[PDB]
């Protein structure tokens, strides 16, 4: 209900200034060689945005959401697990739940009783190890349930590790009139600093047709221990917000989005 | 006191027609939403069974030609089409005031086809005379309706002390009467004449019904 | 599917008391209650008591005090206490299940329970055959004189039963402490004098079952 | 649900929650199978070119002369205190005579039914309180007897009963329509594909006339359509052939 974790250190909040990210396809239509205008949820360029760390500094705040919500997940041993979506991100109302378990992204909506700051837990990360997951405070109860999924199974490398991050994970998170669509882009990188100065246009995911209201967000993160005193590995997140600000795509023959333009 | 003055006491109806059977209540009204009562039908040759609960439902195991409605005091059984399975006495049973007793009871008989009496004479043997008792049986049975008048009369005057009968209503497997009548007498009575006569009048036969027979028919 | 024979009972004398066992099979006697009646003794069918949902007891106006439920639930049978018995208290006695509204909606086969100070007599069969010189019309007719017993009824069949076209069961009629019952059959005449008729009796309180041969 | 292996009862159905799927309803319609179909607001036919946000199979069994009651604008013991349907149902309802495979020896006395309750439910309103209420002012304190009734009361499914008595398989399809997103849709039927002809072409997403015949463009995975340089639609990728 109001679980939250103690070994948290004490340190201000990061921010950071996006370069150009937070720009993705708006629609599933192949274009050769133009400059398409649009107007969309997208992240605008040269704005500052936050910067939250998952490690033994280990962010997860209860953070807004208005229209929608830019990240780029950088991990190195997959600490973020899912993310959590709902207005009262409580028993009381409906709430998304976005959760990984190593094996299956498990989306489901009811009416999750999320903490104030949930997590999943790898036991014995020093020896006789076997990389299973025990722990799950992700809720404490659920009721009402109006949609379950169950993602394609994959297989998340659990393994706590330190030092610089290597994958780059950037999703996309808004929630236009209930259709919450949900874009995806993953892609190797040595970052050891703040949010990348590049562009990637995110391809869609999955659209969850739920139909809820959505006003503030979470994010899941892993722990490890060899349920207050876990810590976590090497990972961090970030928060961009979108506005519905003019951007253009320039399309190539191939059809990806090669650059983008904000007015 | 709730007086359950259910009428009619008995009906004879005929096939394919509609018979009614009212039933009246006191007490008490206004259970949940009703207060209908629970009427029944007991056959002569099975107990009774639930007809309709609450007079506005069909109950099962019994044909759904049952129906009806009432009023907060006044209840009634519509029954169509009367046919030849609601030979049976109809109940109406208290549910809402103890006693939960049932109302007076109305037999309803059905009008089936008429049928003629076999006639068959069986007078004491010789140990039954030894034993003491002289009983002269003679089986009136497979018959309709039940209006029959069996009468011993013999040879020497009219009898009226020794006569007896033994009559079977409708069964509900045998669809016709049946009644074995018997002449209680003693051995010098038996002995005093030598031949006797199994009299009898039934509704449908219009000639008499007799048939003689000696002492030494054993 | 819903059994509610009864038996246990069977001769009572008057101003004694003795318990109708009512087997109960089918449904749940927790969940439903058990119903006690009487086939019609004078006026219409006279209901006596009611079990429960597992409870308390209701009872008729007049039979309040003189008769009494009790449930056993460890056998799955409701016992029918009766006190202070009568020679008009002799009739056939029936337990259903309780429906929804109060209501009776399986019903038992029931026993004839008979209140009298006397003991049980056995049976006095006579085999009704006809003579030699008997008259007959294109049929033979053959019967059984099931003469002075006590108590009613008796059960009467034809060759285990065998026989079953022209088989009438008639009524026993009350003697002087005793009954008298009658019953027939119409069978061809290849089946009489030539073949061997047997008439069984089957009394169902002392089950007692001897064949006689006509 | 239709042919599950075994149905709940009236006041306790089963609500079988069908969601973002598509069926064939012609098949069911001439499955013979069925002793009932009837759809209120809409033919079967009629509904193959709709679609719908939720769908919900509430499967329970009643008496032969029970069925006129679970239908719009009819009132009823089922239809007022055990299964409440709205006054402008746009669903349907479909029955099997189920005496061959629900009855048994004895009877099938476990489909229950409430003769009465303290109100009326509303549209789609399920209850299962199995509590036993006073009507009177004499306090019964659980257990019925002396004007206190029982409302559970069984069904009398039984082999050799009548029809009307007979167990009856109705599973009401509740059609309804909320503000999510639809995602229930009938049998979205197709013609055949012609390449290298003038043809009118009718998608899913976009319509128009031209010749459509396969080039050296390569759409993404999620690009169902394309546009040229003027951003109007030349190529087009089939839904059923990649």
């Known amino acids: 209900q109001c679980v939250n974790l103690t070994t948290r250190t004490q340190l201000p909040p990061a921010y950071t200034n ?62 973020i697990r899912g993310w959590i979506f709902g207005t009262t991100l409580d028993s009381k109302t409906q709430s998304l739940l976005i959760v990984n378990n190593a094996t299956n992204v498990v989306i489901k909506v009811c009416e999750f009783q999320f903490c104030n700051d949930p997590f999943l837990g790898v036991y014995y990360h020093k020896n006789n190890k076997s990389w299973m997951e025990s722990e799950f405070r992700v809720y404490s109860s659920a009721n009402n349930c109006t949609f379950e999924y169950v993602s394609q199974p994959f297989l998340m490398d659990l393994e706590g590790k330190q030092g610089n991050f290597k994958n780059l994970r950037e999703f996309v998170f808004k929630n236009i009139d209930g259709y919450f669509k949900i874009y995806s882009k993953h892609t190797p990188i040595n970052l050891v600093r703040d949010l990348p100065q590049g562009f990637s246009a995110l391809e869609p995911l999955v659209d969850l047709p739920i139909g809820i209201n959505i006003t503030r967000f979470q994010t899941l993160l892993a722990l490890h221990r060899s349920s207050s005193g876990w810590t976590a590995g090497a990972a961090a997140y970030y928060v961009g917000y979108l506005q519905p600000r003019t951007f253009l795509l320039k399309y190539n023959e191939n059809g990806t989005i090669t650059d983008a333009v904000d007015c | 006191n709730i007086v359950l003055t259910q009428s009619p006491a008995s009906l004879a109806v005929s096939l394919g027609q509609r018979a009614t059977i009212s039933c009246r209540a006191s007490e008490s009204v206004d259970s949940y939403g009703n207060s209908f009562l629970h009427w029944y039908q007991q056959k002569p040759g099975q107990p009774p069974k639930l007809l309709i609960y609450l007079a506005s439902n069909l109950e099962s195991g019994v044909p759904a030609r049952f129906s009806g409605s009432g009023s907060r005091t006044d209840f009634t059984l519509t029954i169509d089409p009367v046919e030849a399975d609601d030979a049976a006495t109809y109940y109406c049973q208290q549910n809402n005031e103890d006693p939960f007793t049932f109302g007076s009871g109305t037999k309803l008989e059905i009008k089936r086809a008429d049928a003629a009496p076999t006639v068959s004479i069986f007078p004491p043997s010789s140990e039954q005379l030894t034993s003491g008792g002289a009983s002269v049986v003679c089986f009136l049975n497979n018959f309709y309706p039940k209006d029959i008048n069996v009468k011993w009369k013999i040879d020497g005057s009219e009898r009226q002390n020794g006569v007896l009968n033994s009559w079977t209503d409708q069964d509900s497997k045998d669809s016709t009467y049946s009644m074995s009548s018997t002449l209680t007498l003693t051995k010098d009575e038996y002995e005093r004449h030598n031949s006797y006569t199994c009299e009898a009048t039934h509704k449908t036969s219009t000639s008499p019904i007799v048939k003689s027979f000696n002492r030494n028919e054993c | 599917q819903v059994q509610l024979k009864q038996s246990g009972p069977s001769l009572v004398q008057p101003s004694q008391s003795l318990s109708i066992t009512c087997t109960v099979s089918g449904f749940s006697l927790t969940s439903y209650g058990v119903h006690w009646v009487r086939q019609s003794p004078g006026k219409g069918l006279e209901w006596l008591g009611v079990m429960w949902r597992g409870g308390n007891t209701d009872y008729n106006a007049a039979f309040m005090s003189r008769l009494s439920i009790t449930k056993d639930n460890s056998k799955s049978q409701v016992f029918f206490k009766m006190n202070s018995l009568q020679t008009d208290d002799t009739a056939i006695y029936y337990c259903a299940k309780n429906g929804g509204a109060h209501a009776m909606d399986f019903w038992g086969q029931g026993t004839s329970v008979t209140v009298s100070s006397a003991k049980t007599t056995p049976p006095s069969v006579y085999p009704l055959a006809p003579g030699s010189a008997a008259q007959t019309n294109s049929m033979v007719t053959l019967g059984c004189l099931v003469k002075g017993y006590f108590p009613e009824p008796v059960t009467v069949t034809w060759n285990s039963g065998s026989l079953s076209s022209g088989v009438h069961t008639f009524p026993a009629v009350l003697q002087s402490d005793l009954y008298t019952l009658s019953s027939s059959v119409t069978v061809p005449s290849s089946t009489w004098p030539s073949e061997t008729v047997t008439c069984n009796v089957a009394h169902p309180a002392s089950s007692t079952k001897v064949d006689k041969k006509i | 649900v239709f042919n599950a292996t075994r149905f709940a009862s009236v006041y306790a159905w089963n609500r079988k929650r069908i969601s973002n799927c598509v069926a064939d309803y012609s098949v069911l319609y001439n499955s013979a199978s069925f002793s009932t179909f009837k759809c209120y607001g809409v033919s079967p036919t009629k509904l193959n070119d709709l679609c719908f946000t939720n769908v919900y199979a509430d499967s329970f069994v009643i008496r032969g002369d029970e069925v006129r009651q679970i239908a719009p604008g009819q009132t009823g013991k089922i239809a007022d205190y055990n299964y409440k349907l709205p006054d402008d149902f746009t669903g349907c309802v479909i029955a099997w005579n189920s005496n061959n495979l629900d009855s048994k020896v004895g009877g099938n006395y476990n489909y229950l039914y409430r003769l009465f309750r303290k109100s009326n439910l509303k549209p789609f309103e399920r209850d299962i309180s199995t509590e036993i209420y006073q009507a009177g002012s004499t306090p019964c304190n659980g257990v019925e007897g002396f004007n206190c009734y029982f409302p559970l009361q069984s069904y009398g499914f039984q082999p050799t009963n009548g029809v009307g008595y007979q167990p009856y398989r109705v599973v009401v399809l509740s059609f309804e329509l909320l503000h999510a997103p639809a995602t229930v849709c009938g049998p979205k039927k197709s013609t055949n594909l012609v390449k290298n002809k003038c043809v009118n072409f009718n998608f899913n997403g976009l319509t128009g006339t031209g010749v459509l015949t396969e080039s050296n463009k390569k759409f993404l995975p999620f690009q169902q359509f394309g546009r040229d340089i003027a951003d109007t639609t030349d190529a087009v990728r089939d839904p059923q052939t990649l």
């Open chain 1, 18 to 79: 996006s370069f150009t990210r937070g720009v993705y396809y708006p629609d599933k239509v192949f274009r050769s060689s133009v400059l398409h205008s649009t107007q969309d949820l997208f992240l605008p360029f040269f704005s500052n945005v936050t910067w939250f760390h998952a490690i033994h500094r280990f962010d997860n705040p209860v953070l807004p959401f208005n229209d929608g919500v830019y990240f780029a997940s950088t991990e190195k041993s997959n600490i």
